[PDB]
Every structure is written in C-alpha cells, then in structure tokens.
C-alpha cells in the first residue's frame with residue numbers, strides 16, 4: 335500500500351468557485367492557479383483511490399476494475415513526483431503532464447462499466463453501485479473541468495475564459511447537437527423528427543458548455559429514438575420534438591418534449607439505474623442526472639404513457 | 654365523552670372496491686349495499702372524530718374547529734340511532750338521513766380553513782397541519798363518494814351506475830370546465846387564454862367524475878390566472894393553455910401547460926402548503942394533490958421560471 339495516498343484520502347477538497355474562475359481570467363494569475371492545481375489534483379485523485387479501496391472485495395478484485403484503480407495510483411504518483419511550481423516555466427512543464435493524464439484516462443467510464451458488467455453476478459445492491467458510479471464519475475468530471483480549464487487559459491480563444499464561454503447561447507449549443515442527432519437518426523431510419531426550439535431563444539450568458547456537450551446528445555438520442563420506434567408504421571410522418579429554453583436569474587431550464595409513446599410504468603423505476611436500457615450501454619440517463627446534480631441542478635422525467643415524455647434539465651447559473 | 658365512538662375509532666375501514674361498485678350495479682343488491690353503508694359510515698365518522706381528538710389542545714379548542722368536531726359527533730349519533738335495515742323500506746328511510754348529512758356538512762372545508770386561520774399564531778408545524786387536512790379532507794371525500802354513490806344507484810340515469818360514468822370522455826369533462834373557467838376569466842380581464850386539447854381526445858372509459866369536477870377547475874383557474882397576470886401589458890394577445898390527454902391501461906394522465914411565467918423559486922417549496930397563495934384561499938392545490946393521491950394517483954408540477962408551468966394530474970383507472 336502507498337502511505338502518501340493515505341495522507342490526503344480524507345483531506346477536504348478546496349472548491350474553486352465557477353465565479354472565481356472568471357475573477358482570475360495572464361501570467362502571474364496563471365502561476366497562482368497552476369500552484370492551486372498542483373496541490374488540488376492529488377487530493378481529488380486520492381478521494382477516487384479511497385472509493386476503489388471501499389468497494390466490496392469481490393468487485394474491487396475484478397481485473398478491469400483493478401486496472402482503473404491502478405491507473406489512478408499511477409496518476410497520483412506522477413502528479414506528486416513533480417517538483418513545486420516556482421516560475422512560469424515550471425507551470426508549463428506541469429500542463430504537459432495534465433494533457434497526458436487527460437488522454438490516458440479517456441476511457442475510464444468504459445472500463446468501469448465493463449468491470450461492473452463482469453461482476454453483475456455479485457451485485458445485490460443497485461443503490462451501492464449507483465453511489466459508487468455517481469461519486470466516481472462526477473468527481474472525475476470535476477477533475478476534467480479543472481484540468482481542461484487550466485490548459486484552455488493558455489489560449490486567446492474568442493468569447494472564452496478557459497472552458498467558460500462568456501456569451502453562451504443555449505439555442506446555438508442545442509442546434510449543434512440537434513444536427514448531430516438528426517444525422518445519426520436519419521442514417522438508421524431514413525428520417526429523423528424535426529426539432530423545434532422555443533422560449534428564450536435569444537438568451538446568452540456566462541456558462542461552461544462541457545456538461546451540456548455530454549447531456550444534450552444523450553437526451554436528443556433518447557427523444558429521437560423513442561419517436562422513431564413509436565412510429566415504425568409511418569416512418570416518414572413523425573411528430574416533432576419540442577425544446578423550450580427558460581432562462582432566469584437562478585438557473586437555465588431546457589425542456590425536451592417528445593411524442594415517443596412514453597416510458598412504460600414497469601420500466602419507470604429502472605430508467606435511472608446504470609446498465610438499464612431497452613435498446614438493442616444504459617449509462618446516458620444516470621450519468622446525465624448525476625452530472626446535473628453535481629453542478630447544482632437536476633434531471634427530471636415526466637412520462638405520459640401512450641403519448642410521450644418530457645425531460646427537464648436544470649442547470650444553476652455561473653453567478 | 655361518548656363510549657360508542659371509542660368502540661369503532663380504531664376499527665379498520667372495509668374498502669368497497671371501485672370495481673365492486675360496478676359488480677353490484679336493483680332491489681336485493683341495493684339492500685346488501687345499504688346494509689354495508691349503515692355499518693361503514695359510523696366507522697368513517699369515528700375515524701374523523703379521533704382526528705379532532707388528536708389535534709393539539711390549543712387548536713382543537715378553537716370554536717370553529719369545535720363546531721366541526723361537534724357536527725361529526727351529531728352525524729355519528731344520527732347514523733347509529735337508526736335501526737337496522739331489514740327490508741327495502743328501511744333502506745329507503747336511511748337514504749333520506751344520508752341526503753340531510755350531505756347538505757349539513759357542505760361547508761366543513763370552509764369551517765376548517767377558518768378555524769385553522771384563527772389558530773395560525775399557535776401553529777409551529779406545517780407538516781402536522783398538512784397531515785390533519787390531508788387525512789380529514791380525503792376521508793371526507795371517501796364518505797361523500799360512498800353516500801352519493803348509494804343515492805345515485807336509485808336513478809335510471811344514462812351511462813351511469815351511481816356516480817360511476819360507464820363511458821366517461823376526459824375531453825368532454827375538460828371542455829365543460831374550460832368553458833366555466835374562460836367565462837370567469839373573461840369577466841375579470843376582458844379576455845381568457847384559448848385552451849387547446851390534444852392527445853387521446855377520443856378516449857372513453859368507466860370513471861368517477863367527482864375528483865375531476867374538483868381538480869380540473871382548480872388547475873384551469875391557476876393556469877388562466879397566471880397567463881393573464883403574466884401578460885397584463887398585452888391582455889388581448891395571450892398564449893394558449895395546452896391540455897394533453899394520455900390514456901393507458903394503468904392510469905389517465907392530464908397535462909396542463911401554460912405560458913404564465915412559472916412559479917418563482919422562492920415560492921416553489923410553499924405552493925403545496927395549505928393557506929399559501931400569491932393571489933389577492935390557498936386550498937385548491939394541496940386539496941387537489943391529496944385527492945389525487947387518495948385515489949391512487951398524483952399531482953405534480955414542473956416550473957419553467959420565466960416561461961410557464963406544466964401540471965400533471967395522474968388518476969388510476971377503475972379496473
């Protein structure tokens with residue numbers, strides 16, 4: 335066992351405010367920020383190692399689960415071996431290790447789902463598995479936003495302070511993912527539902543697109559697939575998917591309404607479980623919910639069995 | 654104190670199934686049903702007397718609350734003094750007392766809200782008050798359906814077995830209350846939102862209209878009022894209220910969508926409390942929710958602050 339990991343496995347995380355990210359974004363400010371990252375990332379990694387150590391032995395023993403645990407141990411070793419950042423050249427050296435770790439851990443979610451799939455015969459508690467996956471994936475999301483934000487601060491990209499867009503239009507980010515989903519849908523069925531966008535279509539505000547880039551294609555794929563499966567007898571005459579944007583001082587709400595038949599009563603208690611899918615890998619819906627909650631929001635579903643489903647994505651604002 | 658009340662205050666209620674109501678509905682069947690009512694009503698009344706006896710003393714002491722408690726004691730005395738139903742003439746005698754008690758207790762909800770309003774300075778628990786009102790009003794709803802159903806069984810009214818409509822159209826019962834709400838709305842503002850009805854508009858099925866006759870005008874008044882208050886600057890150009898009917902083997906779902914600005918974040922935790930209203934008596938929403946839950950369903954709200962509100966009324970089917 336590694337005693338260095340034990341030293342910070344229970345140290346509370348120091349949270350960088352999404353408002354503080356705008357406040358610091360530069361040369362001398364990049365150094366203070368890089369010093370923060372250097373000290374904070376091993377703590378976040380150690381909290382994840384603690385999670386793998388706390389798994390029931392028969393699950394933690396899985397070679398795929400063990401491989402992810404060992405990747406986290408490797409990441410902690412590499413981040414802690416690095417000398418302190420005294421100057422901007424030291425700050426730059428560190429950035430290249432962060433880029434390497436961002437790519438080395440690209441498939442962690444895939445590996446975890448694989449390991450847990452192979453260990454399904456030893457899982458008697460979906461609430462324990464939900465806790466492990468919600469905690470692991472949201473904390474990994476937090477590590478990724480910190481890492482990507484710091485790297486992006488080195489660019490003079492328009493309307494962006496790192497990963498924060500200063501003038502994010504929800505209508506534009508929704509339109510981008512609607513085009514992507516309609517193309518995949520059209521390839522599979524020969525047609526895709528037309529998507530209408532209404533509400534506060536002219537809203538623009540400081541926002542981090544990363545969560546929306548994950549959640550939006552997941553909800554659009556679900557609404558479009560349910561609409562096509564529900565109308566196989568009339569595939570070229572399908573009802574529209576309606577998206578409403580509601581923007582207020584507190585949060586952004588995105589409502590996605592489909593006429594895809596609804597989520598059956600028997601399936602409604604399982605649609606938010608990991609691995610659960612009625613398609614022919616069940617991670618889109620529980621991961622989107624855990625991400626929205628991690629960011630101060632929520633993901634709620636309202637089923638109208640025989641008609642369709644309304645999905646409400648609520649995300650707390652920057653300020 | 655009355656010892657007869659004590660004898661049945663904890664006796665469990667025997668539930669008449671909404672399916673059993675169709676199964677019995679006649680002369681000899683009316684007698685067995687009237688015998689059931691005679692024995693069941695004092696038990697339901699005694700459960701309510703127990704509720705008034707269990708209120709904190711400072712609240713139960715209120716003369717308005719005491720007047721309702723004393724009305725229930727009177728109803729128990731009158732129902733128990735009546736001799737057993739040996740024949741159809743005895744069954745008919747009992748019906749006339751039930752009619753009198755139905756009218757004598759017409760305003761019980763009004764009296765209870767008044768008594769609790771005068772005792773607000775001594776209420777430190779909205780969860781206790783919610784429990785008392787949810788239990789009292791839903792059990793009173795149950796007493797009223799039993800009483801009205803038995804009386805209605807004496808009629809040869811088309812498409813009705815007592816209070817059960819054998820071919821209830823949700824679109825027709827919604828249209829009836831839309832006309833009522835639009836007229837009241839037009840009187841107050843000079844205009845009312847146009848109501849569109851979609852989904853399963855041709856659905857017809859066995860159903861008891863009584864719950865819908867209470868809940869529908871409450872949700873329509875709220876959706877229409879919020880729409881008019883939200884558009885005072887353009888009172889003759891207001892967005893439509895959209896109602897969707899979803900009918901499946903398990904339940905009927907009625908979605909009411911408005912563009913009335915939404916329910917504010919500060920008010921969202923209080924809209925389901927009794928007495929809470931932002932209008933210039935806050936019972937419509939908590940009573941509708943308690944009624945829908947009492948009948949195996951639910952009443953759920955989804956707020957899009959800055960845009961509008963979606964209300965979902967779910968009611969379990971007869972079978």
Ligand SMILES: Nc1ncnc2c1ncn2[C@@H]1O[C@H](COP(=O)(O)OP(=O)(O)O)[C@@H](O)[C@H]1O
Pocket residue numbers: 552556557560592594596597601605606610611612613615616617618619620642643
């Ligand atoms: N809009 C919707 N309409 C109908 N069914 C839906 C909808 N959204 C989700 N579902 C159901 O929830 C299930 C779980 O979805 P999810 O967890 O996102 O994973 P996956 O996309 O792999 O199926 C889906 O397989 C589908 O049965």
Ligand SMILES: Nc1ncnc2c1ncn2[C@@H]1O[C@H](COP(=O)(O)OP(=O)(O)O)[C@@H](O)[C@H]1O
Pocket residue numbers: 871875876879911913915916920924925929930931932934935936937938939961962
């Ligand atoms: N559709 C809606 N749009 C906006 N506000 C609503 C809506 N439905 C309910 N509300 C809010 O909830 C409050 C409580 O409603 P309710 O309990 O039905 O009582 P009341 O009709 O006496 O106000 C309302 O006063 C209003 O502020």
Ligand SMILES: O=C(O)c1sc2cc(F)sc2c1Cl
Pocket residue numbers: 381382384385386388389390462465466467469470
């Ligand atoms: O992140 C954490 O703090 C923890 S504690 C714990 C216990 C488990 F069984 S999984 C798990 C995780 Cl993921």
Ligand SMILES: O=C(O)c1sc2cc(F)sc2c1Cl
Pocket residue numbers: 375379406409413431432433435436437439440442474477478481
């Ligand atoms: O699990 C991940 O996705 C990542 S990305 C990244 C960048 C770092 F600097 S550590 C680290 C980890 Cl642990």
Ligand SMILES: O=C(O)c1sc2cc(F)sc2c1Cl
Pocket residue numbers: 514515516518519522551554555558559562613
């Ligand atoms: O039917 C399917 O299986 C799929 S997968 C997918 C991904 C998208 F973005 S849309 C879409 C559809 Cl419609």
Ligand SMILES: O=C(O)c1sc2cc(F)sc2c1Cl
Pocket residue numbers: 700701703704705707708709781784785786788789
């Ligand atoms: O119906 C009941 O069984 C009861 S028990 C109880 C305790 C209270 F404080 S009110 C109340 C009611 Cl309404």
Ligand SMILES: O=C(O)c1sc2cc(F)sc2c1Cl
Pocket residue numbers: 694698725728732750751752754755756758759761793796797800
């Ligand atoms: O509270 C009420 O609304 C009613 S109506 C009715 C009819 C009866 F026969 S008893 C009784 C009561 Cl207790």
Ligand SMILES: O=C(O)c1sc2cc(F)sc2c1Cl
Pocket residue numbers: 833834835837838841870873874877878881932
């Ligand atoms: O604005 C109001 O106060 C009211 S009260 C009422 C009752 C109805 F049925 S509609 C309606 C409206 Cl719109």
